[PDB]
Amino acid sequence: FVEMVDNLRGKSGQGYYVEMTVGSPPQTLNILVDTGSSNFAVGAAPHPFLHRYYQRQLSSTYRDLRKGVYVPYTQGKWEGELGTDLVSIPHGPNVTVRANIAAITESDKFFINGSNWEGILGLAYAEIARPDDSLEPFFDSLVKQTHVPNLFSLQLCGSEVLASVGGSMIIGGIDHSLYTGSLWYTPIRREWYYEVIIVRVEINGQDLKMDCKEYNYDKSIVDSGTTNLRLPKKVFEAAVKSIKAASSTEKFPDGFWLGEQLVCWQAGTTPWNIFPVISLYLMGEVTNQSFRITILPQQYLRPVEDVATSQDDCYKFAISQSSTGTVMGAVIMEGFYVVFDRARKRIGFAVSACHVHDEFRTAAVEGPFVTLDMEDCGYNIPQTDESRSHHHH
Numbered sequence: 344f345v346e347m348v349d350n351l352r353g354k355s356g357q358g359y360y361v362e363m364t365v366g367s368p369p370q371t372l373n374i375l376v377d378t379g380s381s382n383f384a385v386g387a388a389p390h391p392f393l394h395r396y397y398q399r400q401l402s403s404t405y406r407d408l409r410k411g412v413y414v415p416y417t418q419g420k421w422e423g424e425l426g427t428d429l430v431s432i433p434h435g436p437n438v439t440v441r442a443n444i445a446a447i448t449e450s451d452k453f454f455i456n457g458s459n460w461e462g463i464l465g466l467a468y469a470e471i472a473r474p475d476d477s478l479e480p481f482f483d484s485l486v487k488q489t490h491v492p493n494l495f496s497l498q499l500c501g502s503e504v505l506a507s508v509g510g511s512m513i514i515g516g517i518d519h520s521l522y523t524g525s526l527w528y529t530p531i532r533r534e535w536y537y538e539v540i541i542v543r544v545e546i547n548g549q550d551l552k553m554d555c556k557e558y559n560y561d562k563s564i565v566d567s568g569t570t571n572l573r574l575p576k577k578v579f580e581a582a583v584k585s586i587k588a589a590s591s592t593e594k595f596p597d598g599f600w601l602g603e604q605l606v607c608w609q610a611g612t613t614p615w616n617i618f619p620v621i622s623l624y625l626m627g628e629v630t631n632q633s634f635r636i637t638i639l640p641q642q643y644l645r646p647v648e649d650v651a652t653s654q655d656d657c658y659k660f661a662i663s664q665s666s667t668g669t670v671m672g673a674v675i676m677e678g679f680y681v682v683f684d685r686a687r688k689r690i691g692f693a694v695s696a697c698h699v700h701d702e703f704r705t706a707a708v709e710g711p712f713v714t715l716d717m718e719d720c721g722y723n724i725p726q727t728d729e730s731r732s733h734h735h736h
């Protein structure tokens with residue numbers, strides 16, 4: 344899949360995007376690659392942060408669905424008009440599909456100044472699409488309309504401008520040049536988000552020793568659309584305590600641990616070895632097995648170049664608290680080649696050929712670990728009457 348290698352770009356902390364075309368003749372837009380959502384939505388009206396947008400009137404193949412869509416989320420929203428048009432990925436498979444497209448006509452805190460993307464590609468399942476699960480997501484349409492295998496994989500590679508990032512989205516396959524060592528699979532627990540189960544967490548080889556349901560409260564997901572590793576409150580607190588203890592030779596302000604303040608060292612002198620590795624053990628394909636993915640401080644301490652002190656290497660702490668479960672965001676994914684094997688309801692992890700490391704430690708994927716009489720680490724979200732009332736024909 345040589346032609347699909349290196350097809351992702353972006354600015355650090357602002358999401359990875361792929362080039363796509365919409366309409367006839369093709370209109371090129373840069374589109375955020377988001378495994379944590381399920382809509383294909385593109386700027387389709389002027390906005391201060393857009394240099395360009397989808398011009399429906401310029402497309403001979405555009406069809407209006409005569410239905411609006413409204414998408415609120417934590418401290419943001421986008422909304423607009425549903426339709427269909429022809430869509431391709433120039434540095435993807437050699438195919439063109441008719442997909443649903445939400446034409447974004449109004450938004451708040453959605454577009455990011457300087458991110459260089461104009462839309463979002465939700466790669467998750469129909470269950471979480473808006474307005475409802477009857478709006479077929481892009482990848483479903485791609486698979487149904489073409490011979491493209493039902494799988495994609497992601498290799499995310501992490502003074503006045505933010506650092507440029509790159510990576511690969513391989514659609515329809517696995518490219519062996521993008522990883523080394525073994526490729527380990529964890530089940531997709533349920534097809535909505537890419538939900539997985541964490542069975543154990545270690546910080547510098549030390550078990551956090553929590554009830555494993557705490558690791559997945561109220562879910563754990565793999566999300567390219569989240570920068571940070573996000574952890575449930577109780578888990579976050581235990582992790583921060585352990586990371587603080589390991590790095591105790593340095594006394595950082597509270598602002599740092601909250602991700603609200605950078606910490607710096609003289610260029611090239613960053614004491615990586617005082618920061619511990621973090622291991623997440625993921626449920627294996629076999630009942631009582633797990634494997635671990637291990638990330639370095641090179642992943643969870645994000646580089647931010649400072650104008651005021653350009654002679655220093657400065658870092659943001661990129662592990663943060665969640666009230667909506669574990670989020671394995673870019674912090675996790677940057678260590679690994681991640682295979683979203685939809686066909687076989689599983690997610691694969693292998694050491695990425697592009698991950699940032701040093702001569703002492705490396706991001707790792709290791710297994711199997713077998714546990715006698717494995718507990719169920721999955722959390723069952725309480726059923727609301729709202730959700731229960733839904734008929735599913």
Ligand SMILES: CN1C(=O)[C@]2(N=C1N)c1cc(-c3cccnc3F)ccc1O[C@H]1CCCO[C@@H]12
Nearest residue numbers: 356357358377379380416453566567568569570
């Ligand atoms: C959590 N999440 C969002 O809020 C979300 N996608 C995900 N996964 C998202 C992430 C980023 C973003 C910002 C910075 C860095 N990377 C990114 F992808 C920017 C906008 C955005 O829009 C949300 C619309 C509703 C569904 O979720 C979407």
Ligand code: NI
Nearest residue numbers: 733734735736
């Ligand atoms: Ni009914």
